[PDB]
């Protein structure tokens, strides 16, 4: 099918300056019949798409002038001149030149705010669960900015990939952070086979990472 | 007022079919084709189909044919994706739309998995642990099935400092935790207990953060 892919895949934004966002087709979508039928799509948090874009340039009923589109051929733009509050949320492009009609993956609009760091706790197993002969190690990593953030854990000093089970919260309404919980489970026989357990998170606010961990073997 | 009002949310096992609906109200269907779209978190919008209820004429995305059928009953003003053999990849939300209309979309979850109550599990801090002028407690929250569930901080009394992730799919049950940051000047002198509803099993859960003194 014909891809459509976007750039950026998330946009930092400020309320009154500019936003840009790209659409990229792995065909071109200029139609036989001289039209191009390229749209753009909003879509809120839980809420339906709706769009504001239809042949390439033509703003839906409504759609303040601060949207511009433009494009031919494999490329195509979103602006918005100044950024408003309700701009913010997933906007798609959506192709219909090509049968069947594709999607691009979204690029989402978040608010910029200053960097904060992390604040990272660690826990281990509760012996409830230990009971289940499973064992849980969870992480909470929360209210940091901007959303990137690598975590990883590791056993006894040694990086473990396999049993980690992550979530995100959406930016925060309030104080535009994210929060992350990652959750590393283990048989119960394996977790009493080693003592030292650490989550670990590399976030641009520090150029070393933050290292949280328990022995339990310790209080 | 035009309006496109779909179906309620579905739970269906692997296997199973599904009709989902679409009613109109403010025009005719039969004056314009009707879409239905697929929508998933991870792998994103993708068209279906369209039906032209003047004629009942259809067409279908290739990757369809085999799973999607689109009816209309015109003297109902109603569309309507029926959806067969289905599959975890067919968890969803379906759309349908017409001209520049969308609707309310319609939640479709299939699986295979029985009905499970969740393991709540306490995520203790140190009392001895002094960690800043906040305290951070939390409750695992482990294979359930079906979502949703719902959690909240002594009794839904506390509310500041809580992140409940959102739920992910463990060997088709779903896990999420819950995270609650206290001031330090109140714990543990004031308890902290999460509580957790799982209306599908008849379950609610309380646990009791108890401090770990080693």
């Known amino acids: 099918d014909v891809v459509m892919t976007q750039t950026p895949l998330t946009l930092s934004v400020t309320i009154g300056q500019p936003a840009s966002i790209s659409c990229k087709s792995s065909?071109?979508?200029?139609?036989?019949?001289?039209?191009?039928?390229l749209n753009w799509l909003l879509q809120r948090p839980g809420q339906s798409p709706k769009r504001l874009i239809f042949?390439?340039?033509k703003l839906d009923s409504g759609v303040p002038d601060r949207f511009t589109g433009s494009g031919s051929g494999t490329d195509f733009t979103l602006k918005i001149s100044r950024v408003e509050a309700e701009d913010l949320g997933v906007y798609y492009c959506?192709?219909?030149?090509?049968?069947?009609?594709?999607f691009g993956g979204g690029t989402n609009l978040e608010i910029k705010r200053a960097d904060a760091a992390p604040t990272v706790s660690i826990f281990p197993p509760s012996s409830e669960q230990l009971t289940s002969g499973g064992a849980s190690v969870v992480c909470f990593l929360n209210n940091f900015y901007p959303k990137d953030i690598n975590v990883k854990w590791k056993i006894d000093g040694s990086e473990r990939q396999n049993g980690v089970l992550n979530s995100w919260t959406d930016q925060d309404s309030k104080d535009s952070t994210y929060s992350m919980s990652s959750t590393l489970t283990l048989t119960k026989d394996e977790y009493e086979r080693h003592n030292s357990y650490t989550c670990e998170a590399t976030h641009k606010t520090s150029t070393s990472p933050i290292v949280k961990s328990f022995n339990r073997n310790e209080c | 007022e035009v309006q496109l009002q779909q179906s309620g949310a579905e739970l269906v096992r692997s296997g199973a079919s599904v009709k989902l609906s679409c009613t109109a109200s403010?025009?005719?269907?039969?004056?314009?084709?009707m879409h239905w779209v697929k929508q998933r978190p991870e792998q994103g919008l993708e068209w279906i189909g369209w039906?032209?209820?003047?004629?009942?004429?259809?067409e279908y995305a290739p990757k369809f044919q085999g799973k999607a059928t689109m009816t209309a009953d015109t003297s109902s003003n109603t569309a309507y994706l029926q959806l067969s053999s289905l599959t975890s990849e067919d968890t969803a939300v379906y759309y349908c739309?017409?001209?520049?209309?969308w609707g309310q979309g319609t939640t479709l979850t299939v699986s295979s998995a029985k009905t499970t109550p969740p393991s709540v599990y306490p995520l203790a801090p140190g009392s001895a642990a002094q960690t800043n002028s906040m305290v951070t407690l939390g409750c695992l929250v482990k294979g359930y099935f079906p979502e949703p569930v719902t959690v909240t901080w002594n009794s839904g009394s506390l509310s500041s400092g809580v992140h409940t992730f959102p739920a992910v799919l463990e060997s088709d049950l779903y896990t999420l935790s819950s995270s609650v940051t206290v001031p330090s000047s109140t714990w543990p002198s004031e308890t902290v207990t999460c509580n957790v509803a799982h209306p599908a099993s008849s379950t609610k859960v309380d646990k009791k953060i108890v401090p770990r003194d080693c």
């Open positions: 739309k017409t001209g520049d209309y």
């Open positions: 039906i032209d209820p003047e004629n009942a004429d259809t």
């Open positions: 959506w192709q219909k030149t090509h049968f069947p009609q594709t």
């Open positions: 403010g025009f005719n269907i039969k004056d314009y084709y």
């Open positions: 065909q071109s979508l200029l139609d036989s019949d001289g039209k191009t039928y």
């Open positions: 042949l390439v340039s």
